[PDB]
């Protein structure tokens, strides 16, 4: 389908067991917002968009409830055919050209995620790093898998080595993607 | 054992809202079994899993689903995307690096890193002594950073001699093009 | 200004 622009609205995922749900909008392939289902709050990727635009979370909660129902009907109708675990693929790259001493962001792009449950974590000199890290929602792919990005903000140094570590049910061992200046 | 269901609502826009197509998809695990497509005008089963679903959705929901082309696609675009997504403009940063240590008469690659821009439409050109380079230019795919910015790297195969190389960037966010020079 | 969901409709079972 050719178009100048594409909006993804009402996008809903529900998974069992675990009652895992997600509701997002996207425009031209970037995340507008997700609905925090625990807090019943709309969380916009660019905060200035949400200062101008209202999305009432109830619309997301309604779609989640409808997808929970639909998950129930389709699992039974399929005779409880389970999801096939895919093997995710990860790549690490910097947001901007790397200059020693100048702040930057490492981006761990993880693709072919299915089911949408994953653990993406960063290591610096083989030690876990969690402060400041943030990640996107599960963003949809045309083949109905997902992708997700994790961000590590850092100052490049010659004495620091980084890994993005990816754990998923479809991997026998964790995937480790290395990066250094 | 794990079980997943997805719903995808998709609004395709051409020439603003002059042309809109709405597609909704019902997905079990990764199998799309049921679809509404405004170019078709009704729900259709995509696989046998959706065989009896399509008749029920057409009977119960079809008028609301068609109406959403206007009440959701057209509304969301004209009222909310026009003043946010469609007016976002982020200017590219441009830097030039050499892939290998510079050596006279030795093959090298000049890399024009063009980063942090939005929207995706961009034009990047290499020049040598004011002469546009055609052959020996390559580009990465446009890289979506996920933070509503893009980057692209544009490479030029070259060999340092004696002179001046210029990366030239045009983007909707720029009144005038950006030029960055490198001297051999 | 408010953006609206495309609604998930319920399967009949
Ligand atoms: Na209806
Ligand atoms: Na140009």
Numbering used by the authors:
A (entry chain A): 2 to 182
B (entry chain B): 5 to 166, 168 to 189
C (entry chain T): -1 to 11
Paper text:
T-cell specificities recognizing hybrid insulin peptides (HIPs), which arise from the fusion of fragments of insulin chains with peptides from other hormones that are exclusively expressed in the insulin secretory granules, have also been implicated in T1D initiation and progression. Transgenic NOD mice expressing the I-Ag7-restricted 4.1-TCR, cloned from islet-associated CD4+ T-cells of diabetic NOD mice, spontaneously develop a dramatically accelerated form of T1D. More recently, we have shown that the 4.1-TCR is also antigenically promiscuous, recognizing seven different I-Ag7-binding HIPs that result from the fusion of various chromogranin A and/or insulin C fragments, including post-translationally modified peptides.
The sequence of the agonist HIP39 antigen lacking its three last amino acids was fused to the I-Aβg7 chain through an Asp>Cys mutation [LQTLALEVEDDPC] to enable covalent linkage through a disulfide bridge with a concomitant Ile74Cys replacement in I-Aαd. The HIP39/I-Ag7 complex crystallized in space group C2221 with a single pMHCII molecule per asymmetric unit. The structure was solved with a resolution of 1.8 Å. The HIP39 epitope is tightly packaged into the peptide-binding groove of the MHCII molecule through a nourished net of interactions with both the I-Aαd and I-Aβg7 chains. Contacts are not concentrated on a particular region of the antigen, rather, these are distributed longitudinally across the peptide-binding groove, consistent with a strong binding affinity of HIP39 for I-Ag7, as documented previously. Positions P5, P7 and P8 in the peptide are occupied by acidic residues (Glu/Glu/Asp) that expose side chains outwardly, making them available for potential interactions with cognate TCRs. As expected, the negatively charged Asp at the peptide’s P9 position and the Ser at I-Aβg7’s position 57 stabilize the I-Aβg7’s Arg78 side chain through H-bonding. The most obvious conformational change involves I-Aβg7’s Arg68, which switches the positioning of its side chain from an initial arrangement away from I-Ag7’s peptide-binding groove, to a locked and HIP39-oriented conformation in the presence of the 4.1-TCR. The incompatibility of such initial arrangement with docking of the 4.1-TCR’s is readily evident, as steric hindrance caused by the positioning of Arg68 side chain in the TCR-unbound structure is incompatible with CDR3β accommodation.
